[PDB]
């Protein structure tokens, strides 16, 4: 039906909110931003 | 119980992942790690942690695997039956410095260092008590406490005496990163890696937990809406009773 | 106009370009056959015939937009059918296929006719007003014109009754085909090559008509819950429907509903005069609470005597109204309404509902 | 049993009664949530307030002191009153 | 007749969900039974999960569960959720009584659900007391320990059914397997004993705050109490996710990550919070076997409840005192759950001692004497 | 020097921790006056000062807390 | 029949089609994000078989 | 055929050789819908006082319709230009004879009227009905005012409402039959004399989606009506809206067709017997109609099943109704007008209501062409716009507890 | 649950005595006022638990004006209750109105009941 | 019920040689301590001087030790288990951690929350060794 596929657009959508979010409130924890001072 | 007994409460640090959206600071990760093995490694095991846990936290999976082959390994003995090793690999498992609980006791005092791997959720004041603790020891245990030969006395400690004895000293680390290495420095890092190893889905957990807190907060408002609209035409009936 | 079976045929052009066609089927009614043959007859004319079952007839009717029903009156059986001009082809021939070869199955008969005739007969007699007439033309008309209108389970009727009531009756010389809107002569044609042609001249062995017998001065009570009513029936000659007609009307009759006639300033009262081939009844009627109707009889048998002649003459022409509103397809009427006074002093009288409040006929 | 189904759900005979109603997509959703959430639930509170609060309060002074004796016991002024008990 | 009621499977569906003639009085205490539903299912459903990779074994439980945690994709979600999810079930379970409590859903007509319930409350208990035990961290395998010395103390059978349970002579590795076969199971028995809970609420139908009945006025399924269902369903579920993302072990004792070894015990034993109050009991009475006696009387004198209110009128909602007293028993059972967390101490002994008095009191008099009090108000006053 | 060491040194000579510095500190004068007597291994109550220290140590720990983060 | 209660402050200003898409648009996605958050659940759950 | 007289009231007479009977009346618009709570019924108090006069042999009767009202003198054809003088010195003498008259006899009258709409399951349902649909406005009274309104009704008041509504601009004289239409003419100007005035403004009206519930345990049956807003006489799907009606048509479940109707739902509320009767309508205003069902059920327990099955056959309109369906309904509605059109009063009515409330007035030819005009697809979309997915006002009577509330009967509109 | 026989015992009990009629009346009224029933537009004999024989029966027997009023004085309360709002003062319960209209008949209901019972075990 | 694999191993023998003249040692028997311990002369005398009555307790240490110097204590420092902790309590032998309560050199339960002198296990010495 089109509750499955509808289902997707709102999953994606808040998952690339948060995912998009996330790593710009924490990008200065991370590892991915941190691993530079290390290498 | 005494104050004594239950231990000092550990106050509460505003640690960089406290906040309902904030991550583990990986620098501290990495920074702890150093000091665990500089120091802990020593007297305490941290079984459950295996390299492959590191790659994209603290480490990248080059320097895992490199510190992987610095040791050494029991592998199936060979074919002609005599005991074999091998060097060690991203999936092995960290080692201890004790090959057994009896080892570990013997070599101090008969005090048993606890595994790290759960300290952090196995103690009542979790991450602080663990900072709480290391930066506990007085220069000079209150007057008039007399403690057990081997034991040092730490206020956080339930009983007030612990084997342990202060370890983290002033620069005792030079960091990789240049951070200086004051003794509540090493205190921090040390218990945030262990809050990690304690809880390597911290990170992983707590954003799950964002998307979720979104997806049903907007949900449950939408559930209020619906049903208070479809509740409209109940709490909007009016009688009338007109009997003769 | 007739065909060689001599079924009648009348045709005459309607205002509604309609095609109200309709077959009177003489002497069929609830007079003929024994107590509520003539009911359940009605009932099965237009389910099973042997050109189109009920499940396809009623479908192509409903599709060709006509309506059909089956009433069963104490003179005739009357099959009323209402449809467009385009269609009268098809009903004419379906008319024709319902008087000749209907089936008659026992599950219809059990299923669809007993039920319903059943479910009539009470919807019918709740009304106290309709009972009450039933018993008035039973005490008046005792036998033929007074046999009850609808099937009663008190007299059971098995199928074998009704088709052979089918047969023996339904004859050329007992069936009367009158349309209104539809061309005399393409009638004509389609009633001479439909069923109709295959009927009997005459019923062999049946439809021996039986004399009228009115009797009055009777009375009868039947006791009833609701509603009560009292009725007044006063049996008339054929040539005397002029006379009542006009009193009636004189007085108020259910065909003309309207205020400011005397018997309509007492509550529940009506009058009407029931017009038969042979015989007729007027009946003055008053229904309602017991107690109302005690009052309202009295008043409503005054007033019908005791009506001045100049009014009544002056109810003339209220009664050629009322006359000409009657005059259906169905059921047409030719009454010459005069002004000569008409007695009622021979009255019969019924009475239903709470028996001990409604008086008896000798409180008139 | 007590509750038949909806066409007797054993309720007396009931007559006269006229239950009228609108829509919805014809009434204003929400009406007055926000002025109603307040001030009808602050009346149902004061109403409903000392059911709590007389209860509450009791256990609570009661656990109160409990927990203050018990603090006073274990310290170095209640050593002798710890050991007569 | 429309398929929702000519199958009989949806007719069922229908009778429960889309038809069921709740009163249209109802609050939202009455959702709780649906919250306690829906858990019965994540209880379930993360439980069939955690099965999958828990292992039985002494050696292992400790260890598979922290591989469970660590190692399984989603296995910490899986964990957390199964374990606070059980103490929600009983948050929501003990708002179900509380509500059965205030309003005379105990009463008359409904005598036998309100048995079923205790059942399945007693029920319960027991899996979750045997799921915990599962972890076998510290305090997993001293509660097993406690409980089973303390039925040591039947008069006769008390030192044979011991060994029956432990399938040894010690908490040990057949006492966890048992405990984890049972623990799978034992939840299955329980959505019997809710669907016979539900059978038995669908003879009678549910009642109301208000007490009268409800037959005047009474409001279909579908439209209505499933889209009231739907918002505690989502309260329930975000509080839920609030505890089980953030601060998961909240509700759990800190000692239970330590795993079980028998030559040390910790500092303190405590259940798990929800079986606090009835632990509290347990000490208040000094003799082992009345110690465990009365316990089981504190969970099955709601039994004996519906007989002692004597109330004409049904529900509190109604009544001054027996509001006070039900407010003043609820207190005091979370005083005997705090009690049940503390050390038997100079205070708390005698504290708790009084605090399971008033409790059994409350039953057997207070319920009693303040019902029949205000039957003889509510007559006086109207006249 | 780290700065866990100078955020004691801060708080302990606040007006708030004060109190508790003093009675400590008199505390340890009485309990080594305690000491000081021949008989004191006979005493069944050897009195310490756990509990003052306990005392002064969370009123420091309240006011090292919520700062000390900030400087590392 | 009779005089009805007024309504007219509990009426709604939007049309009367209007009203109705938007009850089927927060209806909708409330079913919507419900399949998400199911299909989120039902994929961890899942992973665990792998 | 249309004459506008002196005083430039408007006679509107369909003669026809083949009439039975004649007759005449004076409309004078300005029903129920002109009257306010207070007042109400005052229209057919005034109307059954007026047709209380002397008939002259004539039979005068009232009309008393909603929006509407007139007095009607049937007669003979011959009679017929006498009932019109009768009929034009009714309205001509009306303020005088409102003044001379007691009006206690009429009240009473009127009063018992009023209490047969309330006792015929039917008519309470249906007045119920359009009182709850257009709740708030003057549409929703009674045409017959109630027992408590008639009561308080007093000479002056008929005085004001008769020459607030009877003047020239808002008074018509229909007239049907066989008979010369300029005699009737002739003989009304020189009789017809009422007073100048401009045509009143008529009320407006709203339709709202209500459910009103009279639930009687008493009575035997549950008498329930639903109905969406349907097509005023203006509107140009009047004839759509009928043939929309009739596709779903009557149904008397002891009648002998009962098992061979083609709507779909007799076939389907016999397999259980779910009701005793029902018939589909589309009632008609000047500018707003109800389009819907009335409906009796025997058994209080299937009250739910209907309401479901017939709503279900309802959202059917806009899907799947079949050429079949939509030509048995054209035919049948066809049928059904030129049966409304037969009897003379019935229509002198018919002119006076479109004259009054429409201006112009369809010849039936040109009815009979318009509906053949439709197709299935003009259907299907009026059936979208007006039926899919509306809101619907409800009417209950008796052993109504099966009734489910609104929602539930509202949401059956558009499940697929 | 306790009997309308044994309840109205004990009400007799005390109203006949003048000091617990002087002490406890006051204090009944005011109990009254504030259960708080009287403001939903129910008179006490309303809350009664309906569901039981006896009081089945007593509905059974009550007068037509009684019942009808009965029901609409249930279904105002459960609107209200709905709805979470209360009757204003004017239109709440005045003492004078609970007037208690079904105790005669479930106190008739409980004398059959007891008479049976006790001719059961003559 | 006990499974031929659990029901036998109960006997647990521990070798008693190496514990000290006067020592505490712990020998997990039954998934439980069984806190063994060889009296040392002093304290074997001072108990066998201390009066069993002024005990609350009715036990005396000649019940109590089957071998005199070898005796065996189960591990539960009280009534309801006590991790038992080593040389503390009124007497300065054990203290019940659990509850920080009292007990004595001879077990018993001589001070705090547990009821009776700790349970004796069939401390069955065969020469140098010994089986719970
Ligand atoms: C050398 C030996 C070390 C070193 C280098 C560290 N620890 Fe610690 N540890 C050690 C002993 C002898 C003990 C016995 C504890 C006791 O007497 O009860 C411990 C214990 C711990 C604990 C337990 C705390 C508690 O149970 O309350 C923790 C936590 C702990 N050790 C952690 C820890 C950390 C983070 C270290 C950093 C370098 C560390 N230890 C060093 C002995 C030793
Ligand atoms: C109402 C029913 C149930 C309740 C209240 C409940 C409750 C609990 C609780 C509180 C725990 C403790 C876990 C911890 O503290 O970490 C637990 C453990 C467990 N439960 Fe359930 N449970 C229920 C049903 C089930 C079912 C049906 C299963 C099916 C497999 C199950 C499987 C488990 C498992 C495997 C554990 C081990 C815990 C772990 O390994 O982390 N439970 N249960
Ligand atoms: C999994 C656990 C349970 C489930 C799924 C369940 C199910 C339900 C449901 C669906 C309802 C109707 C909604 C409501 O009234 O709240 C209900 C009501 C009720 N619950 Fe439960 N129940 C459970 C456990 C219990 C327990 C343990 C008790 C008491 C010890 C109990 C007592 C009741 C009672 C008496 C009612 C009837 C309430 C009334 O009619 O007023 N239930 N239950
Ligand atoms: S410590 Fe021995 S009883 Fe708890």
Redesign the pocket.
Known sequence: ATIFGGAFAFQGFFDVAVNKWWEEHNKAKLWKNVKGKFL | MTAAEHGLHPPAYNWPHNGMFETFDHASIRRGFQVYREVCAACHSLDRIAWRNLVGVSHTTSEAKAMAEELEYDDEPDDEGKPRKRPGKLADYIPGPYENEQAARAANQGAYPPDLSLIVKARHGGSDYIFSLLTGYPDEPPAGVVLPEGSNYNPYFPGGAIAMGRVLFDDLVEYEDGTPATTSQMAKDVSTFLNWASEPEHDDRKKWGLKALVVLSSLYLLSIWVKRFKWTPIKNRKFRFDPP | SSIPNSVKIAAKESATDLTKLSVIINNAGSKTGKSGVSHLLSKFTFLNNGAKSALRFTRESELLGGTFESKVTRDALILNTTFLKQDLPYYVEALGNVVSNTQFAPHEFNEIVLPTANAETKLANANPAFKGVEKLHEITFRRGLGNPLFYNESTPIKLEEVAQFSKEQFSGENISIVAEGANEEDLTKFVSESAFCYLPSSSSNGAKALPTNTFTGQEARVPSSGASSALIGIPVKPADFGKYEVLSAAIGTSTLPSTSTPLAQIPGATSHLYKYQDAGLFVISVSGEASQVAQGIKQAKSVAESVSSSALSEAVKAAELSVALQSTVDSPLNVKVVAEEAPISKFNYVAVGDLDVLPYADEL | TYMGWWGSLGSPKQKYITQYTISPYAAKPLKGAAYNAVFNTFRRTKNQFLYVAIPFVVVWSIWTRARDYNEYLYTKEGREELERV | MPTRKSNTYLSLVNSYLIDSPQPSSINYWWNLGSLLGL??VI????????????S?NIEL?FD??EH??RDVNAGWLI?YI??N???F??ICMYLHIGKALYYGSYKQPRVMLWVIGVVIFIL?MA?????????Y?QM?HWGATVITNLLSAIPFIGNDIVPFIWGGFSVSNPTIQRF?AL??????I?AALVCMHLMALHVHGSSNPVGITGNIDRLPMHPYFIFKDLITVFVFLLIFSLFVFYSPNTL?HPD?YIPGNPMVTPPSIVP?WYLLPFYAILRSIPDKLGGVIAMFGAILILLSLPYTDRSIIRGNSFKVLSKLAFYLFVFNFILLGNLGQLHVEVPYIQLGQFATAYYFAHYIIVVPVISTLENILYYIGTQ | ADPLDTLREECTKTAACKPFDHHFHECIERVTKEQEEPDYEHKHYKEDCIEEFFHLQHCVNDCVAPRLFNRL | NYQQPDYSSYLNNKSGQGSRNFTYFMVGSMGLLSAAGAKSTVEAFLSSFA | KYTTLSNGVTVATETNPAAKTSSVGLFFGAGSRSEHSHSNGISALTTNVLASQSAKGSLLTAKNDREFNGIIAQTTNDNITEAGKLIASIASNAVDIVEKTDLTKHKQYLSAQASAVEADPKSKVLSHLYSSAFQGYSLALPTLGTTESVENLENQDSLRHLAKHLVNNNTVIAASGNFDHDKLADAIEANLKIAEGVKPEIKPASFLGSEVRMRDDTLPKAYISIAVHGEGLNSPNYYLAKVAAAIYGDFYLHSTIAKFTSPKLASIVQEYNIVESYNHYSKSFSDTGIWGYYAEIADKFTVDDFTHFSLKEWNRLSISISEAEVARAKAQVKTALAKELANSFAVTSDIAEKVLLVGHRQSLREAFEKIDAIKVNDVKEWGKSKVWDRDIVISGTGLIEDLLDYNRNRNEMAMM | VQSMTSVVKAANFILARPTLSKIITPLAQKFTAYAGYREMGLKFNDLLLEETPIMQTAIKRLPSELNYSRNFRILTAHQLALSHQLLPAEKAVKPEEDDNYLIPYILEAEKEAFEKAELDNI
């Not at chain 5, 209880?43 to 828990?54: D, E, K, N, R, T």
């Not at chain 5, 899996?127 to 972890?135: D, H, K, N, R, S």
């Open positions: 858990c019965l209880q379930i459903a993360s439980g069939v999960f955690l099965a999958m990779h828990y039985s439980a598979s569960v469970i945690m964990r199964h374990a999810g059980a103490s079930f009983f319960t899996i979750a007391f045997m799921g915990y035990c599962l972890v961290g997993s984890f623990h799978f199971l034992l939840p299955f329980l759990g239970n798990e």
